[PDB]
Amino acid sequence: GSLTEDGLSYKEKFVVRSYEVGSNKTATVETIANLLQEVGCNHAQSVGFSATTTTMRKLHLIWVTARMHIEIYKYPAGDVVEIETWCQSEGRIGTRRDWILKDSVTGEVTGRATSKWVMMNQDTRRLQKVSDDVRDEYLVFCPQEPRLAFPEENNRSLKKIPKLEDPAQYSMIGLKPRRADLDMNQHVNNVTYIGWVLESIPQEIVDTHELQVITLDYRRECQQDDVVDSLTTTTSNDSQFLHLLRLSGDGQEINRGTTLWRKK
Amino acid sequence: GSLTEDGLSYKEKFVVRSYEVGSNKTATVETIANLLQEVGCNHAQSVGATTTTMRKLHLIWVTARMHIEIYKYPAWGDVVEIETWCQSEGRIGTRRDWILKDSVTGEVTGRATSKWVMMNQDTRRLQKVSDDVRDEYLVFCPQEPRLAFPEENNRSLKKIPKLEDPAQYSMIGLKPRRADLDMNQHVNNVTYIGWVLESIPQEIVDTHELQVITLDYRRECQQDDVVDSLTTTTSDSQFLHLLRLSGDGQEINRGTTLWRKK
Numbered sequence: 405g406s407l408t409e410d411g412l413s414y415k416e417k418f419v420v421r422s423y424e425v426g427s428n429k430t431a432t433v434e435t436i437a438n439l440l441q442e443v444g445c446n447h448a449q450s451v452g453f454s455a456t457t458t459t460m461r462k463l464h465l466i467w468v469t470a471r472m473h474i475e476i477y478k479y480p481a482g483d484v485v486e487i488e489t490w491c492q493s494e495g496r497i498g499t500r501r502d503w504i505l506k507d508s509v510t511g512e513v514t515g516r517a518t519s520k521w522v523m524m525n526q527d528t529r530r531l532q533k534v535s536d537d538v539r540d541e542y543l544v545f546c547p548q549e550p551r552l553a554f555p556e557e558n559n560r561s562l563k564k565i566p567k568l569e570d571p572a573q574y575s576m577i578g579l580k581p582r583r584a585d586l587d588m589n590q591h592v593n594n595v596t597y598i599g600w601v602l603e604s605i606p607q608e609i610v611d612t613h614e615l616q617v618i619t620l621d622y623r624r625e626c627q628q629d630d631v632v633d634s635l636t637t638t639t640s641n642d643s644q645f646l647h648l649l650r651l652s653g654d655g656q657e658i659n660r661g662t663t664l665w666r667k668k
Numbered sequence: 669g670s671l672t673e674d675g676l677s678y679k680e681k682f683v684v685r686s687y688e689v690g691s692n693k694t695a696t697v698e699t700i701a702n703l704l705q706e707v708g709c710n711h712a713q714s715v716g717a718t719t720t721t722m723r724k725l726h727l728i729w730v731t732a733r734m735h736i737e738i739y740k741y742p743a744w745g746d747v748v749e750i751e752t753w754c755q756s757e758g759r760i761g762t763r764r765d766w767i768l769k770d771s772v773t774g775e776v777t778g779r780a781t782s783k784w785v786m787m788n789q790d791t792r793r794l795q796k797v798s799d800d801v802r803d804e805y806l807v808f809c810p811q812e813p814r815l816a817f818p819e820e821n822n823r824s825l826k827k828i829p830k831l832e833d834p835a836q837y838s839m840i841g842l843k844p845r846r847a848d849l850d851m852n853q854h855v856n857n858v859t860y861i862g863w864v865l866e867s868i869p870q871e872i873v874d875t876h877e878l879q880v881i882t883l884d885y886r887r888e889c890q891q892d893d894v895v896d897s898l899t900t901t902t903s904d905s906q907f908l909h910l911l912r913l914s915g916d917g918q919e920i921n922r923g924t925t926l927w928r929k930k
């Protein structure tokens with residue numbers, strides 16, 4: 405894995421592992437999400453991060469995921485998959501990180517993703533707009549012209565996700581994160597919330613359909629000692645669902661999103 | 669990853685990933701277990717893991733016991749090479765051993781061993797190996813005994829007792845998700861390792877490191893099943909573990925772990 409010739413993006417190849425695939429012998433959506441996350445960690449490291457600047461570490465600010473959008477066309481089965489990631493400023497809202505998944509053999513694009521990141525205070529959990537001086541510190545590592553993965557006029561990543569009404573059609577109650585789900589800072593990995601959202605999708609839908617799109621807004625972080633409830637409702641060959649992750653007790657909303665499924 | 673010069677073992681190098689480490693910035697025991705499993709999968713593939721006679725008879729290889737000793741956990745970014753190989757254990761079953769080495773210093777940072785038995789995949793019944801299916805796997809095994817844990821009266825061959833109630837520690841309501849299931853829709857054996865350790869307190873994890881883990885697989889956990897994880901200190905620190913179904917209290921696993929100071 406290394407930065408491209410200009411140094412404004414990063415590339416990395418991955419061989420799909422045995423424990424990374426599902427019932428259809430192809431890489432699960434959580435494995436793909438982990439590979440996108442891994443390539444983004446190494447891009448921050450290659451340009452000198454450990455991804456907070458010296459100014460961000462002084463004021464106690466961190467980058468947090470606010471929205472994640474992942475569209476897959478072909479899930480890699482032993483296959484080699486190369487991912488090209490890059491970041492771009494989104495004015496004073498925050499940052500945007502895009503990915504392009506390509507099959508290393510056929511060279512075709514087998515998927516792509518985009519995420520919106522915001523600047524949150526490490527301790528008070530309070531959000532704030534990216535100040536001018538902090539913004540230009542990472543501008544030197546971003547393409548100046550707009551390079552989006554999803555350039556489409558009314559693209560399916562900038563649409564507002566509604567709140568699921570009760571009763572939910574499907575549900576999966578009592579979901580708790582384990583030590584494997586926690587990261588190096590002891591927080592529940594963002595990829596775990598993707599797997600929790602999909603736990604409410606029926607087994608019949610998973611066995612007769614494949615996941616094409618997944619848009620997910622991160623509202624609140626799930627602490628290790630918290631228990632979640634996953635809810636789903638069909639809103640529609642293609643099938644659409646409305647998802648909502650919320651705490652078991654107080655019913656505190658932690659996530660909301662939508663998924664699109666295509667026939668096999 | 670490729671077979672060694674003789675073809676009686678397989679080697680593979682791995683770069684530790686960001687999402688594969690814990691709070692100490694070193695690879696979790698479940699990630700190490702996954703790497704050992706992955707290298708064993710490719711060793712079976714590299715030699716062409718059920719034969720035509722086993723497929724015709726409707727038989728499969730199932731893990732009966734797993735023993736893993738780690739001395740140095742590879743940190744995020746480190747390269748770790750694992751050398752795996754199989755050996756016949758007479759008519760009982762098969763034994764697969766691993767040697768984890770640091771690719772920079774060349775030293776051994778860990779080693780593992782597992783006992784596998786021959787079970788009929790449909791009726792779930794353990795069957796005797798028989799001479800003919802045994803000689804099919806002998807052409808891919810070292811003839812002389814090559815054990816990762818060769819010590820007589822070692823930590824991998826001692827009988828694990830059943831945990832008595834009340835358990836000192838516990839973690840109830842553990843359910844496997846779609847990520848925990850494998851290609852055949854079964855809960856992969858690394859999830860049971862993570863479930864065993866869920867009952868270990870946070871104080872023990874934050875002030876100690878996992879050195880040894882011996883685990884006997886008694887019953888498989890179906891996707892629609894809920895487990896209860898129990899732990900009791902028997903002592904370095906030693907614990908006695910027991911995984912059992914929430915409802916009927918059906919035992920699915922039993923094992924022991926040894927923890928060293930940091």
Ligand SMILES: CNc1cnc2ccccc2n1
Nearest residue numbers: 468469470531622623624625
């Ligand atoms: C107040 N806005 C947000 C946005 N995204 C989040 C993701 C995780 C945790 C808290 C979050 N808060």
Ligand SMILES: CNc1cnc2ccccc2n1
Nearest residue numbers: 730731732794885886887888
């Ligand atoms: C009765 N012997 C055994 C040995 N190992 C097993 C592992 C998984 C499921 C059932 C098993 N049964």
